[PDB]
Amino acid sequence: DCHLSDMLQQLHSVNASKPSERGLVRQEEAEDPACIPIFWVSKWVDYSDKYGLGYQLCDNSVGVLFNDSTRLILYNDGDSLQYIERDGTESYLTVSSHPNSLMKKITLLKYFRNYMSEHLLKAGANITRLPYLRTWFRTRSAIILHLSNGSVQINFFQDHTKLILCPLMAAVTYIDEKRDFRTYRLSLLEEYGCCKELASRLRYARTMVDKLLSSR
Numbered sequence: 001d002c003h004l005s006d007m008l009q010q011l012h013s014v015n016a017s018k019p020s021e022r023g024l025v026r027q028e029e030a031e032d033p034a035c036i037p038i039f040w041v042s043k044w045v046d047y048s049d050k051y052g053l054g055y056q057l058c059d060n061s062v063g064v065l066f067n068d069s070t071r072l073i074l075y076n077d078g079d080s081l082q083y084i085e086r087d088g089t090e091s092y093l094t095v096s097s098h099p100n101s102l103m104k105k106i107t108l109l110k111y112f113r114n115y116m117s118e119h120l121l122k123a124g125a126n127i128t129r130l131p132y133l134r135t136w137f138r139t140r141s142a143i144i145l146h147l148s149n150g151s152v153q154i155n156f157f158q159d160h161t162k163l164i165l166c167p168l169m170a171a172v173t174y175i176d177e178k179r180d181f182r183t184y185r186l187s188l189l190e191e192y193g194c195c196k197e198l199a200s201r202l203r204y205a206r207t208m209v210d211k212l213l214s215s216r
């Protein structure tokens, strides 16, 4: 159990309040820079049909969630490896030590690494323990990223709008079409309201988070 239970409480409360239909809306008053996320997914590559999912964190680290449900992570120095089993047990390595065991998986990771650097661009670049990708799925409209620190990210394909939900600080960071990185306290959104756009994706978020809960 990550903090999805209670992520759901935060969203149910925000949506039940209907921040879209509100007399005077001052979305700006709902912002709070003390809730700015440290980690989010900046790039991702779906290759589940074969290997699994590769992604890049905003800290320039790269991970891969394989079809066997193990995760390999390369740190920002390009040498340190962290490996997480199904069981969630961790162990640490370096590429340079050339471990026989992970040779096949290290190689696949490096492949994702290169693709991402060559063909993909940094989502939320302008902005100032390392988690892993616990689980993920995509709809026809979005891809849903569940990190091990409890945060859940939703990326909407059509217009490149992203949500980062942070259960701990009870927060949400919304990246709009103009690529503006605005962070809000979910509770303050109830009070001050928000625009129809954001209020609809918070709804979608809840449906998605609920979908994460019934698929453990």
Ligand SMILES: O=C(Nc1cccc(CC(C(=O)O)C(=O)O)c1)c1ccc(C(=O)c2cccc(I)c2)s1
Pocket: 045, 047, 051, 108, 111, 112, 115
């Ligand atoms: O570098 C590789 N492909 C590549 C190398 C040189 C030139 C091209 C042609 C190139 C192109 O047509 O622009 C492309 O398809 O990327 C392919 C690959 C590196 C990894 C590949 C994998 O087998 C791999 C395995 C797991 C995940 C991923 I992304 C890729 S192939």
